[PDB]
């Protein structure tokens, strides 16, 4: 039922809050978003940005992907994301994971009609 472009909401979008303060967001947020049900996925960032700024990023630079592909942008300023990374001593079912809030450009793969973005691609 989800869709690729719905799907890299769930995974990165988190429009609520404008910074990840306290070092348990990246626990809570990495299980409501479903991503520690079958694995505790090991990395994963959240950028706190409205929906509409980080779909226009799809119209800004296009650059090569981390893949060699060529339907990656970066986006003009940087963003507010947040880098949840899990720790040495995670393990599944317990995922734990450290909150790391920046500021960076973000680059996302876009793709479809309309034309959005579909996957994170990294933050520079």
Known sequence: ??????????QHMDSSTSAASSSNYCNQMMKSRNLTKDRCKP???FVHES?????????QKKVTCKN?????YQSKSTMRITDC???GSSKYPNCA???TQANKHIIVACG???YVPV?????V
């Not at 996957?119 to 933050?123: E, G, I, R, T």
């Open 97 to 99: 994971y450290k909150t």
């Open 43 to 45: 990395v994963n960032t």
């Open 85 to 87: 990374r899990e720790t």
């Open 1 to 10: 039922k989800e869709t690729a472009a719905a799907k890299f909401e769930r």
């Open 51 to 59: 929906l509409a700024d980080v779909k226009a990023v799809c119209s």
């Open 68 to 72: 060699g592909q060529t339907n990656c």
């Open 119 to 123: 996957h994170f691609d990294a933050s």
């Open 112 to 114: 479809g009609k309309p």
